[PDB]
Design an enzyme around this catalytic site. Structure first.
Site, PDB file in Angstrom:
ATOM      1  N   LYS A  71     -19.923  -0.877 -34.097  1.00 32.42           N
ATOM      2  CA  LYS A  71     -20.010  -1.834 -33.059  1.00 32.42           C
ATOM      3  C   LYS A  71     -20.183  -1.025 -31.842  1.00 32.42           C
ATOM      4  O   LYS A  71     -21.070  -1.183 -31.022  1.00 32.42           O
ATOM      5  N   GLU A  95      -6.309  -1.182 -26.386  1.00 32.81           N
ATOM      6  CA  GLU A  95      -6.881  -0.311 -27.350  1.00 32.81           C
ATOM      7  C   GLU A  95      -5.825   0.467 -27.937  1.00 32.81           C
ATOM      8  O   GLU A  95      -4.849   0.816 -27.298  1.00 32.81           O
ATOM      9  N   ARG A  96      -6.044   0.842 -29.192  1.00 35.00           N
ATOM     10  CA  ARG A  96      -5.130   1.684 -29.843  1.00 35.00           C
ATOM     11  C   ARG A  96      -5.560   2.959 -29.383  1.00 35.00           C
ATOM     12  O   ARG A  96      -6.730   3.178 -29.101  1.00 35.00           O
TER      13      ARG A  96
END
Lengths: 487, 167, 58, 127, 466, 467, 106
Positions: free
Chosen positions: E154, E180-181
């Site tokens: 993506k 976000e991780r």
């Protein structure tokens, strides 16, 4: 000169508990220090609950809130017909300054029965479907309910555009001052829109009150009432105002939020209900006046943008129950490419007739009906069904009629054309033709008749009522035209 | 119940919860000032930590909120019913706020009235007085008298920025 | 095509004049905003007119 | 924290020496009234769940013994009340007229033959 | 000025500034907070006390601990040297190459462009990607919302986009890693490193990474939105830019808004939602636009919240969406990278009267054809091909060519593709489809339309075969 | 006495009268108020303060402003001169023919008639509308509720009752447009002039108009009901009269109530609905009656927002009802006007006695079949149709005929219908169903029954359709 | 007095000790109660401290002295807990006496 001031008792949340000034008028618009306005809604003893129009990052604690000493008014005047303003009535157009140096209370009541009068006025939109099928006069509250640029917005635009001819006309008695109160539509959105209007320069007869997507909620809230006041003026200067309230749904949010921020709880749908009162009162000011008001009208086309079609939703129910009809628009048709995307099974003008001409009646009676049935046989008959000739016809024809009301976005029209082409179809002049080519036919036809039979058209406009001879002339014109359309 | 009074000032609830008692009580029998002054004393009868050990620690029971007295009325000389406001602050434990009540109070004398009207500058010039666009103006010359221009003035502000603000 | 040439020059001079106007303004005002203690009597005229408020409001 | 009773009408006399609370122990005066909710000041010793009687002639029941006042459910309306009616205890929790001369009756909730016969005996009364 | 901890209850610190009344959003730095414990002024409670929201965690909080008001919102470096720097929200690196080294700083709220600033009727941003341009032709300034296949590349696609455009037109990028991780930011990190679209030795690090991850206090994540905007505005106005602004996933930002709402003592609303949800958004969105300054064009990863939308936020978002991306597994499943679905790659501004039917109809013909073909696909699914009219057979093949023609190699994923990527110039693309549509090549290998750049290269690709 | 505005927090005007605190229900007149600004005392809040309600706007108020307690509720002229006059809540004209001059004056509250005061048993009234009578066989002097959504022809319908019936009953009526959408109230008005149902020549204008619109504050909206009631009560008790009491819409009363509750510092309980939803309503509804001195036949519009009935409000409503006219959106949407949910639209006085058994049974059979059919809808919905008992098939169709037959064109709203609407003398109706039941029609197309009046004619209509 | 580092239980009946005093107390600080209980002074109010009690009370009663430990909670770390059942203090409940993990870590 603390003898016109107070200190912000606490501020947080754009919620100003305001210290002092107990001299305060109920409903006073006050001004805070920052050029920011607020309104002293709540007179608590030890503070004034003041709604902040704007923001308090632009403020700090203890700030002086100074009376404006004024109950909410809006600048009012007609030069705004030729302006886009913010809610405060200040040129967000930025053109120059408002010509409006009249002011008018925004909180003016919706007048009484006796201070009003019913409709007999018609009003046009150039949208065949509309003027016909939910034929609308002026005063009328009609809910536009509809979705993501289905032309949802467009719809209002073409209508406005249509009035151009009228504003180019002499139907002053019908001169429709348009107010598009834009709630929640971002600056860009507006930018496009306004621009379009500019181009159409309908703007000369137009206020666009713009509380964009960004806004401080009270502004957004206020804006319609504002628009309303401005339009009430026109109405009351005899004129016929058209306010498009666009959209109170968003307003509702803003308000709700406001209420909630006011810690004031809500009811049903988490929604506090006097948004109904709000709007009701707002919209009650949409009316068709008697003669005293120069016969005025403020025709309200509120918009509520459906999402999910849950009319079931309180707020739609509300609005319906207020309105004098709704134009429900159907998106599916839109995907199908169909603008107007209406479902006029879901659109009604319970009025209708105050706005109508025999010309129109003469084609429309049959058509509306035909469409009803057509729709009915659209709905039951053949799609993978039966093949009774009657109904099959109704479908063919119907299908035809469907296209025929199908109207491009950016396509408002003169009524006579409309009755004309519609007439054509009504009278079945196209069953013998396949649907796409109707469209072609119409354009061509139209330009033809415009050219030659402007005579006839002229007349048709003039009498407002098709006449037998004309019918023949028309017929001929069409048949032959049609004949030309083929050969 | 009562058929109360609140002489000039009037401080609502806001511990005026209390005030209003004495705003009729002191007020009635017109011990306003008498008591105002009771309070003044009290002020410092406050100001030691020890008077109000319940104030210090509420963790002293209402024993001490009846020996309050002997932080205040037992301890007192003057105490007509400025002892009574004790007895309220006592149960109604609010002793640490009491100054504000006192503050509030003073309104008595003319200072039970007053106000500095201000546009700009020093305008910390107080008024106790009771008639205006009168006394004010006169005062406005007492004040004009001498000199007087401080705080930080007309210069930034209304007057100075203002033209800028038109821009 | 004739218009297109002209209105650009007008528009540039207009915007240019505003970007002079603002820039001179803040610079002049930000330089000269000092003489209030040198001439006190802008607050003496405040107190003059303010006395003709403190008298002449009511 | 605040105390309703910091109504300096209350305070305002307790100062000046007040007595019997300020509305009685077994009577109270309606501190605020609205809506068949009589917060009634005084009534210090007063049974829990006591039926009381108002000087609007109405009955009420002392549902709430708040330390200061009694939330009194009003067996009636408050346009019929004005703040400070003396509510006198009945000394007693509700019992109701009870009996067997009820057989054949339409009585109201308070056991008064609303039939239009009007009242009757009440051989029993009952908790 | 100094403030005091007067109250700490979690990361809501009510600080009494004992001498200050700095407006709300004035950034406070807590003294004795080695780690930059920004408190953002939230409410002026009175009492010289403000409710602040700690935006860094709470610890060691001395009662009355000293706070020094920074007196304006966070001012942060703004300057091109950020491209190639991962900062946390606070604009501190987290790329840790000492600080980031602008001088031009900005207080982290920026305001909407206004009417007078507008550039009234928008403009398509074009990527040169067939799918994009065709189906949801992007608008410069537009906020486009990415529903989309997870981990499918993506991001890669996005990199490719950056590549295609931000290179092409001199756009730059800001990435706001919202929710976000650390892991995912990492993933990106290397992806960018690897890709060399972040270049920690070159200014071909075209992206400033700004991270506003989960692990932060809400305020930070919440505010990372304003922040990210603030940078891009810097590039926009200053660097004239048409910015690509990745805010990914804005949804979590939103969540954060709501999270705090409650904990701002405020009622959020039903469904949890801060009632201001819209205004928050509105105000945010309105900063993001097209003006006489360039465009801040917004590529927004957008989660389908609770896979529902009833939930007001996306519903609102729809307004805030203008061109819509659902990145699609089906397509992916077809092995087609591009993996986008056309019937979703739409734009509310994608309307014929409102953009154009060249897209809309050539597409309608196409979308028709594919779908129609889908209609046949069920038929065929039973029957095979045989039965159909030949025209249908043709159309199937064409649809399929077209389809295949959408398969477009990747420059940024020679690792996946084993190819260079491609770009397709829009006219040529379309023209391409006119050709296939015209049936012109339907006597050619359909699978030559597979993985190519120009439609010519599909044609070329056909030829070598036959 | 004088009070001072101490807080106006909205139209809750918090007044402190220092000059005692005379009871609740004291009307206060705000002094210095341009509009004579009635406040109704609601709470003696304590300490010389009352919470009051402004019913009017809150303008210009300076907190302190003097209110001079008028010391009793709004007193309004009551009695016959109100007939043909359009009144506001504050029992003051909007007829715009100046004062009304019927000198019995009233506080707008009145309290519920004693047990003895009730006319003990009421007896069926009728209307002649098939659907109506059938399902709700009218009760003399009952309170009839119209559950109903958003004036869709609802409003038309209520009118329709008024037209056929309110006309049919000769004696006086009261119309209370509460929250009324003034535009239609205009129309109605103008119509009454037009019809001569209002005549500015007589108060034999069979309707006194009371309007308490939706541009009004809640305080007004809440209370206009009481007002209307007080008046009709005049006519009932005093003037005998089956007053027909049109309330459109009680909901707005209610609504007005709920909205304030919050502001009343109360909890605006479930659904936002006030705690006291029952008592206010209940007591109010209980004021309405057919006493031993007559009838207030009340056709009470009940907006049911989103038509939820499970919804406490309607849930309550039922308690007071006598005949429920449940409008069915489901039905309506089929284009049907009538809109009713039939097997909800009821009258308790379903009887083999009162309605006589003929109706009763026929109806019960009908009710049954429809109910049964209802069962089938579900079935066909999911099972298509087509393999059912054919008797069911028949009924399904029949039911539709019946339905259709129940449908009637509109007699006033040729504007809506392009038809005139009809009325069906009850026996032709009972008979009607008996006939359909008899299958007499049922070997026919289904079409004709739609929008019909008397069943024979539906057959007639069949014939024309049998072509 | 010690407020800073001690408090008297202002109210208790919940395992949350609103603590009078406790006026220098750090965020997250482990405290120790007059009940032998631990708590952590979670809520630092301007006036008192809501201290979440790390266990269960009645062992407390009002005014009980709560003393700072002046430490944010730590647990032992190491890996001699491997083979050990502990409570959340990272301390045994195994009832095998103590672990071998004599590092501690916040």
């Amino acid at each position: 000169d603390l003898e016109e001031t107070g200190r912000v008792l606490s501020i947080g949340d754009g919620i100003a508990r305001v210290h002092g000034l107990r001299n305060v008028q109920a409903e006073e618009m006050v001004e805070f220090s920052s050029g920011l306005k607020g309104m002293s809604l709540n007179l608590e003893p030890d503070n004034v609950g003041v709604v902040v129009f704007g923001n308090d990052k632009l403020i700090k604690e203890g700030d002086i809130v100074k009376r404006t000493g004024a109950i909410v008014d809006v600048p009012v005047g007609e030069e705004l017909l030729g302006r886009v303003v913010d809610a405060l009535g200040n040129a967000i157009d930025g053109k120059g300054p408002i010509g409006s140096k009249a002011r008018r209370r925004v909180g003016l009541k919706a007048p009484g029965i006796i201070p009003r009068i019913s409709v007999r006025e018609p009003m046009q939109t150039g949208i065949k479907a509309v003027d016909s099928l939910v034929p609308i006069g002026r005063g009328q509250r009609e809910l536009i309910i509809g979705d993501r640029q289905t032309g949802k917005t467009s719809i209002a635009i073409d209508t406005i555009i249509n009035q151009k001819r009228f504003n180019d006309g002499t139907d002053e008695k019908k001169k429709l001052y348009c107010i598009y109160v834009a709630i929640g539509q971002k600056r860009s959105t507006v930018a496009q829109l306004v621009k379009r209007l500019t181009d159409a320069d309908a703007m000369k007869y137009t206020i666009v009150v713009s509380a964009t997507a960004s806004d401080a909620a009270p502004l957004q809230y206020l804006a319609p009432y504002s628009g309303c006041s401005m339009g009430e003026y026109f109405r009351d200067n005899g004129k016929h105002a058209l306010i498009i309230y666009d959209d109170l749904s968003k307003q509702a949010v803003a308000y709700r939020q406001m209420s909630l921020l006011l810690r004031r709880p809500p009811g049903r749908e988490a929604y506090p209900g006097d948004v109904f009162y709000l709007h009701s009162r707002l919209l009650e000011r949409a009316a068709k006046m008697n003669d005293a008001f120069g016969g005025g009208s403020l025709t309200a086309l509120p918009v509520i943008e459906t999402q999910a079609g849950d009319v079931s939703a309180y707020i739609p129910t509300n609005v319906i129950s207020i309105t004098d009809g709704q134009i429900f628009l159907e998106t599916e048709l839109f995907y199908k490419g169909i603008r107007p995307a209406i479902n006029v099974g879901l659109s009604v003008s319970r009025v209708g007739s105050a706005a109508q001409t025999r010309a129109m009646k003469q084609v429309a009676g049959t058509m509306k009906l035909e469409l009803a049935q057509y729709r009915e046989v659209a709905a039951f008959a053949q799609f993978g069904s039966d093949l009774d000739a009657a109904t099959q016809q109704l479908l063919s024809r119907g299908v035809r009629l469907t296209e025929l009301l199908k109207q491009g976005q950016y396509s408002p029209m003169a009524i006579e054309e409309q009755v004309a082409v519609i007439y054509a179809g009504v009278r079945g002049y196209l069953d013998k033709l396949e649907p796409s080519k109707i469209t072609k036919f119409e354009n061509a036809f139209l330009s033809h008749v415009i050219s030659q039979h402007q005579a006839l058209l002229g007349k048709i406009r003039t009498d407002g009522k098709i006449s037998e001879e004309s019918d023949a002339k028309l017929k001929e014109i069409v048949t032959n035209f049609l004949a030309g359309f083929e050969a | 119940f009562a058929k109360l009074v609140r002489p000039p000032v009037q401080i609502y609830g806001i511990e005026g919860r209390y005030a209003t008692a004495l705003y009729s009580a002191a007020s009635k029998q017109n011990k306003l000032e008498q008591v105002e002054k009771e309070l003044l004393r009290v002020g410092q009868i406050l100001k030691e930590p020890k008077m109000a050990a319940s104030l210090l620690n509420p963790y002293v029971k209402r024993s001490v909120k009846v020996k309050s007295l002997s932080d205040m009325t037992a301890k007192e000389k003057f105490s007509p019913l400025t002892s009574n406001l004790i007895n309220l602050l006592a149960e109604n434990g609010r002793l640490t706020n009491t100054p504000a009540v006192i503050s509030a109070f003073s309104t008595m004398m003319s200072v039970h009235r007053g106000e500095v009207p201000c546009t700009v500058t020093t305008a910390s010039a107080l008024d106790e007085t009771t008639l205006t666009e009168l006394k004010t103006v006169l005062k406005s010359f007492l004040s004009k008298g001498q000199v007087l221009k401080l705080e930080v003035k007309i210069d930034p502000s209304i007057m100075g920025g203002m033209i800028v603000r038109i821009g | 095509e004739v218009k297109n040439r002209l209105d650009y020059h007008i528009s540039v001079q207009n915007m240019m004049r505003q970007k002079e106007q603002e820039h001179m303004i803040n610079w002049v005002e930000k330089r000269v905003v000092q003489s209030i203690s040198a001439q006190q009597e802008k607050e003496t005229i405040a107190k003059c007119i303010a006395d003709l408020k403190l008298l002449s409001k009511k | 924290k605040t105390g309703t009773a910091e109504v300096s009408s209350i305070l305002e006399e307790r100062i000046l020496g007040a007595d019997t609370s300020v509305d009685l122990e077994e009577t109270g005066r309606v501190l605020s009234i609205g809506d068949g909710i009589a917060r009634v000041h005084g009534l210090r010793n007063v049974q829990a769940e006591e039926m009381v009687e108002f000087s609007s002639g109405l009955k009420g029941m002392s549902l709430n013994l708040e330390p200061d006042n009694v939330g009194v459910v009003v067996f009636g309306n408050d346009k019929l009340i004005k703040e400070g009616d003396i509510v006198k205890r009945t000394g007693a929790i509700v019992d109701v007229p009870v009996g067997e001369e009820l057989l054949g009756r339409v009585v109201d909730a308070l056991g008064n033959a609303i039939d239009g016969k009007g009242p009757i005996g009440s051989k029993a009364r009952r908790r | 000025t100094t403030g005091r901890i007067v109250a700490v209850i979690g990361a809501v610190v009510d600080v009494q500034f004992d001498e200050g009344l700095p407006p709300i959003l004035n950034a406070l730095e807590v003294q004795g907070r080695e780690t930059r414990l920004v408190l953002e002024v939230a409410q002026h409670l009175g009492e010289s006390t403000v409710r602040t929201i700690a935006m860094d965690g709470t610890e060691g909080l001395v009662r009355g601990q000293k706070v020094l008001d920074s007196g304006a919102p966070i001012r942060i470096p703004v300057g091109p040297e950020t491209l190639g720097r991962i900062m946390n929200v606070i604009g501190e690196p987290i790329d840790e190459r000492g600080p980031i080294k602008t001088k031009q700083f900005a207080a982290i709220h920026a305001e909407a462009p206004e009417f007078v600033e507008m550039s009234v009727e928008q403009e398509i941003l074009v990527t040169g990607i067939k799918v994009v341009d065709l189906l949801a032709p992007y608008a410069k300034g537009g906020k486009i919302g990415l529903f989309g296949g997870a981990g499918v590349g993506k991001t890669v696609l996005i990199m490719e986009l950056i590549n295609n455009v931000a290179k092409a037109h001199g756009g730059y990028s800001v990435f706001a890693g919202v929710g976000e991780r650390t892991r995912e930011g990492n993933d990106l990190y290397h992806e960018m490193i690897e890709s060399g679209v972040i270049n920690l030795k070159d200014a071909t690090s075209k992206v400033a990474l700004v991270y506003g991850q989960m692990n932060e206090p809400p305020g930070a994540r919440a505010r990372v939105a304003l922040t990210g905007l603030t940078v891009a505005e810097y590039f926009r106005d200053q660097e004239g830019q048409d910015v690509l602004l990745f805010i990914d996933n804005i949804f979590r930002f939103t969540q954060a808004g709501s999270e705090v709402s409650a904990l701002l003592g405020r009622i959020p609303s039903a469904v949890g939602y801060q009632p201001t949800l819209a205004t928050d958004m509105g105000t945010m969105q309105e900063r993001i636009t097209t003006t006489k300054k360039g465009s801040i064009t917004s590529v927004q990863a957008i989660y389908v919240p609770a896979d529902d939308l009833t939930d007001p936020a996306p519903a609102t978002t729809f307004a805030h969406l203008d061109a819509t991306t659902v990145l699609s597994r089906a397509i992916a499943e077809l092995g087609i990278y591009p993996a986008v679905d056309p019937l979703d790659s739409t734009s509310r501004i994608m309307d014929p009267n409102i953009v154009g039917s060249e897209h809309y109809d050539v597409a309608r013909g196409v979308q028709k054809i594919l779908q129609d073909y889908k209609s046949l696909q069920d038929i065929i699914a039973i029957l095979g091909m045989d039965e159909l009219s030949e025209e249908d057979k043709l159309t199937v093949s064409r649809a399929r060519k077209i389809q295949r023609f959408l398969s477009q190699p990747f420059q940024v994923a020679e690792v996946f593709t084993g190819h260079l990527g491609k770009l397709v110039p829009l006219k040529e693309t379309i023209k391409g489809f006119q050709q296939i549509l015209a049936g012109e090549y339907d006597h050619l290998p359909e699978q030559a339309f597979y993985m190519v750049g120009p439609i010519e290269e599909a044609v070329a690709k056909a030829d070598k075969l036959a």
